[PDB]
Design a protein around this nucleic acid. Structure first.
Ligand SMILES: [Ca+2]
Ligand SMILES: [Ca+2]
Lengths: 229, 236
DNA sequence: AAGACTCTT
DNA sequence: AAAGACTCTT
């Protein structure tokens, strides 16, 4: 299927620098700010080839602070849009998975298409293991030092891997499970369903203070449902 | 000087080169996206070699942050005068049509400027200058090396300038939740020429160290340079 | 857990 | 505008 083909293509598909039209190659930085944008760029060709093969249109956002990186859909079936978004983090694991106060609480905030038009939200997660100030020429490619000791990727539904603790404070992001690479691949989350994942993050309080009288984790949210919300 | 050479070297490479993609040691090339999250990354990678060449040329050592949320991108200093360090940070913004007014976000106003060692590679006091290399670009399949000349670039124009942070600093925040200083809202010439609003680096520093986080909080203190001057006039 | 590191209306 | 969207480190 689209999903299994994409997953296979992803595993199938070593970036070592940026290159100018003139043939000069500048090496990469060793931080996630750098790598996150590289991985995103490295993935576009793949997503588009596969979608192409399955009859879907791929679409990127116009406004820069919009979810998701790639919106896929058939023109005959438009209300069955798939959302794919790249997330990166490093090892020497857990991800940040987006805001919990935007499109999940408000159908049209910072989202390319209204949230109810997406039937799936896949996360493509890259994990790289943390390990030059000169420029190179096309032929010194094998002398340029890579800024990572290795890389692993996976595709998985956002709900399956979401955790119950916030991923960021002032930028109110959902944190994912804090698990080994395998657990993410297999999909061993904590939410019993996507409906539970949504309800939980649509009612999560922004800070410890207000959270203290509601719920701060999964056991407590469940105890909050029993009490009658 | 270093300042003059750096500007020359930056302005130079910028015109002589157009970055077009990322490349794999196996020779495959991937195109770039036309967003700032992408361009800011490119521009700092594209500047590292130039800053490092010009730096070595003047006996300066160069250090980059070890931790990911530290300023500045580049700390420059001669081992003979480590108490007169230079901080250079790369800022990027875009424009949809050449000649329009632009603005940059210039960093936090609650970190290193308020706490001598919060999120900075070296204590704020060991830095004698804070330079901003600002890049402005006009927004606009895999390839093999023999096609470099054909990959479409994700921008039509790229201008660069080097200027002191205090000189281009404005009086309105650049971001809310992430509490950034916002630059002047002006044309690129004003950034190069240095036509700011502050009179000294001391005033820039005092204004931003007393800027309140929210409008409600500021409404009673000061919300712009004028009110801040009156504020100062009356005894704070 | 909270707060560090450009865009949009 | 002011406020709030878009991985890391105590
Ligand atoms: Ca994204
Ligand atoms: Ca920086």
């Amino acid at each position: 299927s689209l999903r299994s083909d994409l997953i296979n293509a992803l595993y199938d598909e070593d970036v070592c620098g940026i290159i100018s039209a003139e043939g000069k190659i500048y090496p990469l930085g060793s931080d996630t700010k750098v790598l996150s944008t590289i991985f995103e760029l490295f993935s576009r060709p793949i997503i588009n080839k596969i979608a192409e093969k399955h009859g879907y249109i791929v679409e990127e956002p116009k406004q820069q602070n919009h979810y998701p990186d790639f919106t896929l859909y058939k023109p005959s079936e438009p209300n069955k849009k798939i959302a794919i978004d790249i997330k990166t983090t490093y090892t020497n694991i857990k991800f940040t998975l987006g805001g919990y106060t935007s499109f999940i609480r408000n159908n049209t905030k910072n989202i390319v298409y209204p949230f109810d038009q997406y039937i799936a939200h896949w996360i493509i997660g890259y994990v790289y293991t943390r390990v030059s100030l000169k420029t190179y020429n096309i032929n010194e490619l094998n002398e340029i030092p890579k800024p990572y000791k290795g890389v692993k990727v996976f595709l998985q539904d956002k709900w399956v891997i979401a955790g119950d603790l916030a991923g960021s404070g002032n930028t109110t992001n959902i944190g994912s499970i804090h698990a080994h690479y395998k657990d993410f691949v297999e999909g061993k989350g904590i939410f019993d369903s996507e409906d539970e994942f949504l309800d939980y993050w649509r009612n999560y309080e922004r800070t410890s203070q207000l959270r203290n009288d509601k719920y701060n984790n999964i056991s407590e949210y469940r105890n909050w449902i029993y009490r009658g919300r």
